[PDB]
Design an enzyme around this catalytic site. Sequence first.
Site, PDB file in Angstrom:
ATOM      1  N   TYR A  18    -101.943 -60.727  -4.281  1.00 41.32           N
ATOM      2  CA  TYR A  18    -100.520 -60.460  -4.417  1.00 41.32           C
ATOM      3  C   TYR A  18     -99.672 -61.309  -3.467  1.00 41.32           C
ATOM      4  O   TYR A  18     -98.565 -61.713  -3.803  1.00 41.32           O
ATOM      5  CB  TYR A  18    -100.242 -58.973  -4.190  1.00 41.32           C
ATOM      6  CG  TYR A  18     -98.795 -58.603  -4.409  1.00 41.32           C
ATOM      7  CD1 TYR A  18     -98.175 -58.825  -5.640  1.00 41.32           C
ATOM      8  CD2 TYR A  18     -98.037 -58.046  -3.382  1.00 41.32           C
ATOM      9  CE1 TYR A  18     -96.831 -58.502  -5.839  1.00 41.32           C
ATOM     10  CE2 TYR A  18     -96.693 -57.718  -3.570  1.00 41.32           C
ATOM     11  CZ  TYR A  18     -96.100 -57.948  -4.797  1.00 41.32           C
ATOM     12  OH  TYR A  18     -94.785 -57.623  -4.977  1.00 41.32           O
ATOM     13  N   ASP A  35    -104.888 -54.429  -9.489  1.00 41.78           N
ATOM     14  CA  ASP A  35    -103.601 -53.749  -9.440  1.00 41.78           C
ATOM     15  C   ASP A  35    -103.636 -52.397 -10.137  1.00 41.78           C
ATOM     16  O   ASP A  35    -104.301 -52.229 -11.159  1.00 41.78           O
ATOM     17  CB  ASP A  35    -102.502 -54.588 -10.068  1.00 41.78           C
ATOM     18  CG  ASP A  35    -101.132 -54.015  -9.794  1.00 41.78           C
ATOM     19  OD1 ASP A  35    -100.677 -54.097  -8.629  1.00 41.78           O
ATOM     20  OD2 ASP A  35    -100.516 -53.467 -10.732  1.00 41.78           O
ATOM     21  N   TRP A  95    -106.708 -57.369  -3.190  1.00 45.03           N
ATOM     22  CA  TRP A  95    -105.424 -57.083  -3.834  1.00 45.03           C
ATOM     23  C   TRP A  95    -104.277 -57.731  -3.050  1.00 45.03           C
ATOM     24  O   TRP A  95    -103.440 -58.442  -3.618  1.00 45.03           O
ATOM     25  CB  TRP A  95    -105.150 -55.570  -3.928  1.00 45.03           C
ATOM     26  CG  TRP A  95    -103.810 -55.279  -4.602  1.00 45.03           C
ATOM     27  CD1 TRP A  95    -103.531 -55.371  -5.934  1.00 45.03           C
ATOM     28  CD2 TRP A  95    -102.561 -55.006  -3.954  1.00 45.03           C
ATOM     29  NE1 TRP A  95    -102.191 -55.186  -6.156  1.00 45.03           N
ATOM     30  CE2 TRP A  95    -101.569 -54.960  -4.958  1.00 45.03           C
ATOM     31  CE3 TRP A  95    -102.181 -54.802  -2.623  1.00 45.03           C
ATOM     32  CZ2 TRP A  95    -100.221 -54.723  -4.673  1.00 45.03           C
ATOM     33  CZ3 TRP A  95    -100.838 -54.567  -2.339  1.00 45.03           C
ATOM     34  CH2 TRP A  95     -99.877 -54.529  -3.362  1.00 45.03           C
TER      35      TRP A  95
END
Lengths: 282, 281, 281, 282
Positions: A222, A238, A218
Amino acid sequence: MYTLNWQPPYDWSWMLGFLAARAVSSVETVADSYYARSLAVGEYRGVVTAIPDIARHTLHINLSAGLEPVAAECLAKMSRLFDLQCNPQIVNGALGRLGAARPGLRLPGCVDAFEQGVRAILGQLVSVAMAAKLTARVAQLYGERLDDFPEYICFPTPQRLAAADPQALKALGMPLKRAEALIHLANAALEGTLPMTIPGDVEQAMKTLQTFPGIGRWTANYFALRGWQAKDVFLPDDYLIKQRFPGMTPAQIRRYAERWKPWRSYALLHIWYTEGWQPDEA
Amino acid sequence: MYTLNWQPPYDWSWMLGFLAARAVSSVETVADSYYARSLAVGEYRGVVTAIPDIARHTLHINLSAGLEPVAAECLAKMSRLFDLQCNPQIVNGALGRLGAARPGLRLPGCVDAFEQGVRAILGQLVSVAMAAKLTARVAQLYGERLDDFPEYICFPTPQRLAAADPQALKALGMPLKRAEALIHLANAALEGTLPMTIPGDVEQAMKTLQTFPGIGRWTANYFALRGWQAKDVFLPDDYLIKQRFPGMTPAQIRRYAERWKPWRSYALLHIWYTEGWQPDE
Amino acid sequence: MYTLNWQPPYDWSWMLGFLAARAVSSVETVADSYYARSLAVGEYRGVVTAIPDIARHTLHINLSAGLEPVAAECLAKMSRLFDLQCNPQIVNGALGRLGAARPGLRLPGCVDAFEQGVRAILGQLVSVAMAAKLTARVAQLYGERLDDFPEYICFPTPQRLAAADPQALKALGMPLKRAEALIHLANAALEGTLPMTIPGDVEQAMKTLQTFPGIGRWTANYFALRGWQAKDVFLPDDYLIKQRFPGMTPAQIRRYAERWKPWRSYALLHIWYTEGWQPDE
Amino acid sequence: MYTLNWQPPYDWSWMLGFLAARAVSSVETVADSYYARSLAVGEYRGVVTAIPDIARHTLHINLSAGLEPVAAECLAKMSRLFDLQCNPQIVNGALGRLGAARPGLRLPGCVDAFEQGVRAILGQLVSVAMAAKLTARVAQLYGERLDDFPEYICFPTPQRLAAADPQALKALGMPLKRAEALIHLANAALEGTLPMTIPGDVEQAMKTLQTFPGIGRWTANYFALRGWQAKDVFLPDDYLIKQRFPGMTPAQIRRYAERWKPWRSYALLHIWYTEGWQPDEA
DNA sequence: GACATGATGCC
DNA sequence: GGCAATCATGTC
DNA sequence: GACATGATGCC
DNA sequence: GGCAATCATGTC
């Protein structure tokens, strides 16, 4: 003030709104018509103020005296933060109706990859508002104040965070492991092991990023999106994205996201900001 | 036309001359009144033209239309190549008489760390004019050309050089180890393992570069110097430097250079370009 | 000639039967009352003979002339193969009912860890008989013929097997990956990476073994069990074990076995050789 | 009460003396006619007593009741320690002059490679007498006492040394780095990374050992000689040997020693115990 | 969210 | 069996 | 110049 | 002794 161009449409209210929600006290100041914040380029410092002009599709940038020696790099950082390179005609023609609601959407970037790395890590688990709070305390304790502009503080440098006590960071309200992850990231930044610009092979770099302690898929994803402005990455893990694809497993979400290649980053943003979106009734 | 500032003095003649000697055919064009070259930022490509304005202490930069989308980054690239950030009053106030004759000297940077890494490797052992003829053959073979400006060609990308045939690179005029160095360096760049901007710990970063195949200390130092515009690095292993410090070993040279911290990179340039310079007693 | 003691009870019929089914032609000979095989300890070679003496609770060991210089190590090797150290009262006093029916059960070890690692590899996804024939072919092809006993060949050394053609081996009746697994094992033994004697941390040691190509969790456990004579390892991933624990996953069998600590190796043996054994519902 | 044969001649006066000088208080006992020490084979423990019968060239070995279940391994450990496999005719008949004054010279082994590893490291720099005292202090702090022989203590296991406090070991009179070397070596033995038996390629094995913190070329060579009883290793770096080859560099000594292959470990012992020895200048 | 442990098909 | 591929489970 | 080997001083 | 730094050497 310096001026940079952009290609219409540009949804400045959405962008400014997106930035306000994550704004860090003492570092940034976001209003409806401008964006301003502390900025350090090496040992040069100051305040940059970005003011959009919608009638002329121009972005005015003012720099306090301390940043003048590195004017051009400040402009570059702002251009990456505001995705001035975007040609919405290209992206909207490809996303089709997924983006028709807000054609002026842009990819909010960053002004410094290390800072964005620190933000990604602190954004784990918690709410956007909570991270902004935590990030505000890390900056407060480890950031350098500007002599010329007293209640503006520069985001903590790699050297300062690398020499920080894990217990101290833990005390601001984060688990020990998270504080450790920040210190490891600072060291990588000092060594030049953390890519400060987008790499030729993004998926390999994110793979390398995941070996870092405290950085899972993640965060790497990101970070690539915000820290490098990688335009073709989705966030199948997410919190909100899983809600958007109810009852779907991480891999399903991406075979699905595949249709939006090579602008999956943009599809991601639209979905986050489409209130009642749901996978096609196919 | 975009415009950038710079603090006087600035020896444009010396700067232009330095780049002219290293100019790579089809990539850069250097005259005594302007500098121009192909440029690639991601997939945006065009031609940049820099023209110094001595009257106004300004540098005027023009970008073709296909580079306009990434105009700011192009300006940063140019400001790093020409060392616009420099405050000569501070450097000379520190270097004293070493810099008194060429007060307007600047550190010639680069427009992209990867490209500069290639130039550093391809510049090993051979001469300056040779390195430039060689690098041009490489840009010729692996560079992407500009549709809007046929006469120009963009410098090889890391992806292009990474999948390059070794022998193909060698046949251009370099040992196999060199071609191999280039290939590894590109792979490294492709995955973000080559610092593209100056790191916080320059020494440590340079030590890491040295574990790269085909990269020794001279190349790491030189790469840090121009690729990152590190201002406090010296090149004790350089051929010409050894001549400037007769009978002195790399460590004695290095110990001597300590008197110029924290501006050793500028001291280096002044010594390089001062024929017959010799150390004190 | 030489004699070693053991603690009763000791099921010699069962032990010799275990070794007989895995006997490798040309290397070992197993009979009702004795066990014999080739043995190489450095440059000393010969034949070792082991004859159990039930009346005295003793094992008689005879060494051909070439092994006398290193007789003590030959004795030690034999004691590890026949688990002479075992005090059955302690093990049976702990395993409870599980081993009440065969209190003389012992852990069949080995006489060389490398050799044993090779057998573990060669025993993957095949029948006891096939593995034996497979190993035998490997033996004749890369072993050492005893001049004094022409029918006996010494098991392949690591040096000899590390320098083998992956294809000459595949041709014996094994996959390409199986053969590379052996060649990898051999280079490990040659440079000292394969533990030849039981490590203090068996769990960790096994973890590392699993990084070896061709070596998974099953081969690693079976290797610890027989090559190191580890006494508290279990084989949840064993085909036969999976049948003894109907509809249970490795994690579940493994958790059920914990009741036999610290003698899981012995428990495993008892379950392997117990027709309709079933876990308590 | 167990017996092992050996090939004459065997210089027991030399062997016992060599061990006697390196004997570790509370662990070993060395007299003019016998050798005795604590011994741990797994969880089995006791005392081992070896008595040499020159007359009928045999070594009588007695084991405490505790080691009886692993008698064979104790016998093998004694055979390696006393190099009983040695055929002097083959060695003395290959070193010529060099090994003529002491044809009973044997390679002093060890009873456990890990123990020999700890000794090799503690034997760095200091004198034999100091190393022995240093080792004795280590055995006293981390060693296991025998319930049946309160006077004897078992040489420390990898298990205790690996858990040891670097500072505790330092306080015993050794540099912090040496203490750390011991802790890393114990961890290695626990993991199975320390060759406990002579590997096929001693060269490569030693090279890998040199990657261990605290282990250099000398310790690696010396460990191989005594810990694996490797018969073809020289110590061009040894202090005493540097005096035996005045003016020569490690490589020159190494080039020279090649003439004694494949019995260089024996030549090493002979040159060591010949004060007047000196090389040839041709 | 990071991370260690656990539970269909191909060679 | 070795092994990659991957949803699924479960303290920190 | 890159890179193997060989050959002073602070832990 | 271990080990990082340094200098000379011979090659590619």
